């Protein structure tokens, strides 16, 4: 069983996002007090705050790390319709490197791309637009270019890249919505990049999901030949995507997939808020409105069963 | 109380100012080219009479601020852009209800205000840097207050006091004045960094004044003491244009911005970080906001530059706090789980705080231990298989040890066909790679070598190699990562290590580059690689400092710097500061 | 070494020993003394450690903190011209006896003794 340890954050408002770094030794927390804090652990195991600087003018929703090969880089999305890219410079000073302001509505989420694709960033706003920025020169973070923009016809709430590093899978991004209109429309759409046309195109759509979606997450591939996706809603859903063999006609359209749902859990008896995978993509952690965290794993017969329940305090 | 529903109407010209009567039945709207009064019914509003009478345009017609007298229901005042103030009397039977004109100002009159009780006193602040008082008794009404500052933006009477008013200036200063002593001001203080655009007294409190400027912050000031004290500060997303206390609520204020943003906000000062309510009806920049009835907190009125004026109901506003995500969750490389949740879900308002916890396991040490002691080359196949099997059995992974032993039996030898077991080996590799155990598959692939290399396509091999290398780098095991890269069977992975790892060195005496296989300068004929400590020629490893351009043998320099903090060449540079 | 320090402190006329210096591949200028891992002149990336695959670099200008630890200095084999960080290569040659770059046969640490 796990052992709990409380941390005194001293945030003047709600803590919205917590994210670990690449090496699992540093943590970043962004809150609604327009503040971001960085925590480092010591030999004793205690966590100490090492930086606390005001970043934006409105609430800060999401903050994420970049791969260490490019340096200590953070990206944050705010309610003031902006995204910011910060860097650490040597004491430890965090300096704003770039600001992206192309959005006209609240920026809902921001996430980095997998390393093998370069230094790319993806931001989804509340108006239903997902933009992809790229830095051609990794040594100059002050300049960025807008590569692609996609319209989803519905307000966006979360995005996720496909972390597969194989050369047989084109880059994929999944976008979820949190609309509550009475019309039972689709909520999860998956786009794929086409090398020939150099454009992202709609590839798949999950018609069985009609409730508002609060979070989605791909699972780390790490050698598999298909994809696993996890969706958080009034319940927890897990889907598997197996690409089909490409026809000899060599069609230039998006790759076709076979979609199956392999697990649907509703043990939280409430709105499930967050989902997250472990490092190896074998254990799923879900946190809902009950105030408890649940862990899920699958046996060798592909049956997903709960393995642990954790309670605060 | 007043009854109705949210309802919008379209004007013919952009609107710059709106005002309300005492009966909450008619609202006057004025702008650059619009001047009309409207009666709002339970279904919609309808114009009653426009003040744009006469086809001849006038500079006095371009009004920027209009106020409805709170004492008489037939008195209106307008401040034109030509530096003039016009009075309008609805009681006059003439179509042109203009009554009196005062051209005292020379610059644009920014704000005009009435007196709550006196129906014959008006105040005007203009761009001239002066403030003018006017008596409607048609007597000698000239009374000029010189603030000795930038242009005046807002001027307002107090509600409790009869003679006291306040003024804001574009320099960022607020002056409290009295009408009985025009000789000098009573209070003066810098409220904001930059110009201040709006101010308002608290409808119930007797010493609270709220101010707002371009600094995107609205702060409440207390005036009871000799020195004004700041109580609450709220940050918006744009330059704050106008602020109005909500009636019947002691800690609620509505705010409208001036640029960039179009939405109207309702804030509670006790929670200064998220808006209490939001209105997003308008599409252009909001210009005028006003509470309908001084004792009805239910309805609001707002006119914008899109020639649209709308009445909003508080219950119809959007609540961001009701739909905010209240939890954060993340995993760590060592099996740690970080979880931050709202205080209410775990156990003025207890919903404004959160608790952060980390859960730890008493998690994947077998991975590190296996990666550190496996053997991959330098010995015959049987020895490698036996060593790996023993190592696996040490950690309790019996099946892996059995797999290693069976591999040794299969390969390290009236016989079976020469390639009887190829399919089984390929399927075993796939099986071990399909469950995230890339380590075993990569180790087997490296050990077997060419005996199985041709049965697996290159893409899958590259995928496995990259995944294993990424995991090793995550756990910060550089030796094993480089060992895997060196012994890789894939061309790309083998070439991954040779990208820009060659250094160019030149002698500092002749400034010429040196060859790649010698230690003597071609032109200087000097041993350019003499260790600074032992004064011998260095053939192999050389450590160099970027500061003083000195160095030498790796171990010599390391040991020397363990004992002192000076460049051993005697240059004075502290190469490892402190 | 102590005598040399003393003499250099007292006598400014003495010129310290001359040794080698590193040069940028593109600009060709010295890199001795704006991200740290960039050439001061051309702003192009510097060589990268053969083990950590990260570009090398060091900030340039008593019971205090140390700006540039010894473990992050440049190290290279004077024959094979391959190199990286001090600590990484120290560990690698403590456990192995060959140049860490692929297709290199230099026994770099055995040359000096
Ligand atoms: Zn020379
Ligand atoms: Zn030496
Ligand atoms: Zn030196
Ligand atoms: Zn030095
Ligand atoms: Zn250069
Ligand atoms: Zn070498
Ligand atoms: Zn060498
Ligand atoms: Zn290194």
Please characterize this protein's 3D structure.
Chain C: Zn(2+) 3 binds at residues 77, 80, 108. Chain C: Belongs to the WD repeat mio family. This is part of a larger assembly, with chains A (313 residues), B (578 residues) and C (113 residues). Chain A is mainly β. Chain A has one domain (1-243, 258-313). Chain A has no helices and 25 strands. In chain A, a hairpin with a 3-residue loop joins strand 3 and strand 4. Chain A is globular and about 60 Å long. Chain B has 578 residues and is α+β, with helices and mostly antiparallel strands. Chain B contains eleven helices and 34 strands. In chain B, helix 2 runs antiparallel to helix 3 (381-395), helix 5 packs antiparallel against helix 6 and helix 8 packs antiparallel against helix 9. Chain C is α+β, with helices and mostly antiparallel strands and 113 residues long. Chain C contains two helices and three strands. In chain C, strand 2 and strand 3 (83-85) form a beta hairpin. Chains in contact: A-B, A-C, B-C. The structure holds zinc ion (8 copies). The site of one zinc ion has 7 residues of chain C, from loops. One zinc ion (ZN) is lined by residues 545, 547-548, 567, 573, 575 of chain B.
Helices and strands in order, then pairings?
The structure is cut from a larger assembly and holds chains A (313 residues), B (578 residues) and C (113 residues).
Chain A: E1 3-7, E2 15-20, E3 26-31, E4 35-41, E5 47-54, E6 60-65, E7 73-78, E8 83-89, E9 93-100, E10 107-112, E11 120-125, E12 129-134, E13 145-151, E14 156-161, E15 172-177, E16 188-194, E17 199-206, E18 215-218, E19 227-232, E20 236-243, E21 257-265, E22 272-277, E23 284-288, E24 292-298, E25 304-311
Antiparallel strand pairs in A: 2-3, 3-4, 4-5, 6-7, 7-8, 8-9, 10-11, 11-12, 12-13, 14-15, 15-16, 16-17, 18-19, 19-20, 20-21, 22-23, 23-24, 24-25
Chain B: E1 7-10, E2 17-20, E3 26-30, E4 35-40, E5 45-50, E6 63-68, E7 75-80, E8 85-89, E9 98-102, E10 109-114, E11 121-126, E12 130-135, E13 143-146, E14 152-157, E15 164-169, E16 173-178, E17 187-190, E18 196-201, E19 208-213, E20 217-222, E21 229-235, E22 240-245, E23 252-257, E24 264-268, E25 277-279, E26 286-293, E27 296-304, E28 308-313, E29 327-331, E30 337-342, H1 343-346, E31 354-360, H2 365-373, H3 381-395, H4 398-411, H5 422-433, H6 438-448, H7 450-453, H8 458-474, H9 478-486, H10 491-495, E32 504-507, E33 541-544, E34 551-552, H11 554-563
Antiparallel strand pairs in B: 1-28, 2-3, 3-4, 4-5, 6-7, 7-8, 8-9, 10-11, 11-12, 12-13, 14-15, 15-16, 16-17, 18-19, 19-20, 20-21, 22-23, 23-24, 24-25, 26-27, 27-28, 29-30, 30-31, 33-34
Helix pairs in contact in B: 2-3, 3-4, 5-6, 6-8, 8-9
Chain C: H1 2-10, E1 20-23, E2 74-77, E3 83-85, H2 86-95
Antiparallel strand pairs in C: 2-3
